[PDB]
Specification:
The structure is cut from a larger assembly and holds two copies of chain A. Chain A is an all-alpha fold. Chain A contains one helix and no strands. Chain A: It is found in: Cytoplasm, Cytoskeleton.
Chain lengths: ~50, ~30
């Protein structure tokens, strides 16, 4: 799947537009994790 | 072959762009 460019089905654990390439998903996934990291940083230092 | 080398670079670049560790939230009595 990676060499052909299609996103592996074991990584799509959230809704994505139909026909997204793996490169776009990887960039989108990185941004989502960065938001989660910022949320985790704020929650750890600052409470709820 | 050639596909091994180009995929190795692509996977290595992806590992760099993708963040490494994501820390879990700490549960507290008022947090829950």
């Amino acid at each position: 799947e990676l060499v052909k460019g299609i996103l592996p089905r074991s990584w799509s654990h959230y809704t994505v537009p139909a026909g997204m390439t793996v490169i776009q998903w990887v960039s989108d996934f990185s941004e989502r994790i960065k938001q989660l990291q910022n949320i985790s940083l704020a929650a750890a230092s600052g409470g709820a | 072959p050639a596909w091994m080398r180009t995929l190795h670079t692509t996977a290595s670049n992806w590992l760099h762009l993708i963040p490494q560790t994501l820390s879990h939230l700490k549960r507290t009595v008022e947090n829950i």
